[model samples]
Target: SEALAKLISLQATEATIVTLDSDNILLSEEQVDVELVQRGDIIKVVPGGKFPVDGRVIEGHSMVDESLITGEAMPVAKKPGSTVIAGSINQNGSLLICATHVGADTTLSQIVKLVEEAQ
Candidate 1:
């Protein structure tokens, strides 16, 4: 249980959450603010930011660091229609994404759950 707690803490520290306000502005949000994200909801991510939900790029291009999940050192290029995972880093450029999964339904949350179960 101690190990599990540590793992959970590490994961929590790495997690990033954002909320898309009605003005189309992206605001930083707390992890506990796990609001349900709907399809067609526009999410914006800027350079050095982390994605908050699983989504597909609908506008803009960027290099994404998926090392947290893929273990790949190089960042991947993303454009329209490219799928992005939550917790991944946005390396450069800005992006507009259409949310596909939110809250506990995110890939990051699922991965954490799997690790907990395995332990």
Candidate 2:
């Protein structure tokens, strides 16, 4: 049960604050619930924020820390058309991502499911 609890906690640490894009909005703010994010949505994440879903970077540049998922110590550079995974941390720049996988469809969620089955 301890291992299971840790796995659940790991998912919790993925993404907490997310910004949803809107057309009429002049300014925006971060949302606490990443579960509400859907496919085809545009998301904005700043430095130090975790990516909420598996998506492709459509704008901006940054270094992403994928060590949590990739087990690599280095941060990878990301620019337009870069594929990003959920649970990776945005390192040093703002980014606009197109949400291709959300909720149970995310790589993080699938990993969690596999862990659950393995246990």
Candidate 3:
């Protein structure tokens, strides 16, 4: 129970707000429609791109530089099922992300809005 509560609290507090221009290439071009992403939707993330949403790694791997958020210098090798925090920079490799949340409840929205407001 304590772990669950702590998880919930972490989710609530660890929000990273970001936003991108409409011309940003990080967004999907082929399937740009808004679909309900649950806890298991697979998302492909390319290199040198911003993560479109908050998700865990369901498949594949990559080296992500989370210094923008965590001040970590090294590019961490993220494997399958690793939790990739939203707003972190993906330096290389393609990633298969499993959406944990979607819509306004997601850190993606918060990050996007914050970036938008800042600019």
Candidate 4:
């Protein structure tokens, strides 16, 4: 839990994620607990929105960079079905996605735990 807490804060102290109303198809922004995000929740990522969870893209397009996690300096173009990781940067594009992982289940968290073990 401490690892998650630390890693999550390293990513963001208060992460804002879009929560879509499934029944009404409306968008409402919320600063949510990263652990509260769930797999299969439909959400949106706007231009410059940092992804709070690892998810599979459902719609929209973007150029994403995960240099902090993947060490890739180049921004990768993304579209429907592209897998995006938590803490990745979404540059100048909007995205719709189905959340597949969150909290301590994310690669970011895994890296955090690995660092913990290494120490």
Candidate 5:
């Protein structure tokens, strides 16, 4: 698949935190994953869950608690084209994410690899 080569690293196992370098910039983990995600891709996240990548709302939108990303305590409503960061709380709504990117060019993969290789 076109996305296979884009995987710089996986969690190595399920339910594990996958650490990816944020390239030369100090990108939040959420930004990294969002960078790799593409439009119309379905990403599954569990309750009390942290997103593995950034995504757009494809199906249903929810009242997302973005304290992890925005640091605001209140829950925010998200609709289509909203960029959800990895590691943000879902709060009460389940969602289908549309990915915007894939492969080595993805923010997650490129970040870590680019920085590491440069050193």
Candidate 6:
């Protein structure tokens, strides 16, 4: 019940995945670590979807707002082979992202380590 501006809040819970149930539906699952995302996993993010993992664009194209990473307000185009950060907001179009860095290897994880080192 409090909003602390001084705290660096970095957290992600459940993540959706393409499931094998009946015509391939997307099933969202919860986990202790970023919803159990793994390297090389394919994740589909539709418009308005917030990216759950820092990954590379493998299929489709879209613009993403990476205000969390770059402090930029405008959304940038993310073509195939381009990079996408976790928690970035999807602008338009669907994007299939290849999870390259997950869990402790994520960029935010490095920030956590750096913050810990500072303490």
Best by lDDT: 4
Q: What tens digits encode model 5's per-residue C-alpha lDDT throughout 1-119?
A: 32233333332112222233766554222323433444434565544565565557765567776563456798778766667654456655666665464443345554455555545
lDDT score, candidate 5: 0.51
Name the runs in model 1 displaced over 4 angstroms: 1-40, 113-119
lDDT of 1 by residue, 39-75 (tens): 5456667678776667778788899887746677987
Off by over 4 Å in 5: 1-40, 101-119
TM-score (C-alpha, index-matched) for candidate 4? 0.69
Candidate 6: worst-modelled 10 consecutive residues by lDDT: 1-10
Q: How does each model score on lDDT? A: 0.64, 0.69, 0.57, 0.70, 0.51, 0.64
RMSD, candidate 5, Å: 14.6
| Pairs that clash in candidate 2 | none
| Per-residue accuracy of model 2 over 1-119 as CA lDDT, tens digit each | 46544433444323333443675554555555667667866777777777667788888899988775766798789888888876677867688888777666777666766677776
Over 4 Å off in model 3, which ranges? 1-29, 33-40, 107-119
Q: How many backbone clashes does candidate 3 have?
A: 5
lDDT of 3 by residue, 40-67 (tens): 4566677776554567776667788766
Using all chains and alpha carbons, the TM-scores for the candidates as numbered come to 0.64, 0.70, 0.54, 0.69, 0.46, 0.68
Q: Alpha-carbon error at 34 in model 1, in Å?
A: 4.2
lDDT of 2 at 104: 68
Stronger candidate by TM-score (1 vs 3): 1
Error of 1 at 20 (Å): 12
Question: What RMSD, rounded to one decimal, does every model reach?
Answer: 5.7, 4.2, 12.2, 4.4, 14.6, 5.3
TM-score of 3: 0.54
Deviation of model 4 at 15, angstroms: 6.2
Error of 2 at 118 (Å): 8.8
